[PDB]
């Protein structure tokens, strides 16, 4: 029994391939092989074209009050600041725009084959 080889290198070498997120683009917009076995032809072709969110619907839901509580089953301003609130509503608008843009981006790609095609073609 021998001790292992301790190979020592510069700490900077282990960060050679690392790129900060602010310096690289999202490669998930070109991810075709990741959709296989997870995304179906129904989602890409029939569902999403009909049930994609719009900015108007998102804004309406965000601005509207909370929905009324679900019924139980039955067996049958001195301290107000204008600048702070303007900042907060600008932040809310940015957040809603980000939600919309990410929802569009995360369902933009359609599978090459899809779960239905693979299941149909996969014999026991």
């Amino acid at each position: 029994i021998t001790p292992g080889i301790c190979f020592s290198t510069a700490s900077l070498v282990l960060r050679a391939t690392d790129v900060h997120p602010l310096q690289r683009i999202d490669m998930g917009r070109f991810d075709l092989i990741g959709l296989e076995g997870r995304v179906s032809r129904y989602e890409a072709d029939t569902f999403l074209p009909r049930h994609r969110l719009s900015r108007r619907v998102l804004l309406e839901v965000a601005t509207a009050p909370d929905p009324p509580p679900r019924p139980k089953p039955v067996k049958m301003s001195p301290f107000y600041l204008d600048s702070l609130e303007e900042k907060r509503k600008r932040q809310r608008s940015e957040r809603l725009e980000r939600i919309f843009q990410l929802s569009e981006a995360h369902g933009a790609l359609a599978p090459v084959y899809g779960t239905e095609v693979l299941d149909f073609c996969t014999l026991p």
Partner: protein, 121 residues
Amino acid sequence: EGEVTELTPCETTISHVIIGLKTAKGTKQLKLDPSIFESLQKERVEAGDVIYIEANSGAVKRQGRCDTYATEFDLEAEEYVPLPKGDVHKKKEIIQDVTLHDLDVANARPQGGQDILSMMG
């Protein structure tokens, strides 16, 4: 990006994760998609750690402990990192060039995957 001052999952399962990130320019409270909680737990993120979270992907990287906690023990195997200087929320508009081969090789093999076949790959 910033030092973690609070990490509280909100139960309905977890509806969302409220995180508190600190920088030299202030503190920000963020509501995270519940899928990021798995990434935060995998990265072993606790209060006092300096992390960054990608808004578009939910990726979490724990890049060490804050150097303000360097004296909490006399001998720990930790990497102590300065508190980030700018704002917690950082926006940058970038132009990156890729070639068609990069997109081809990115789709030749799967990435990640918690299945046994994916891990062995």
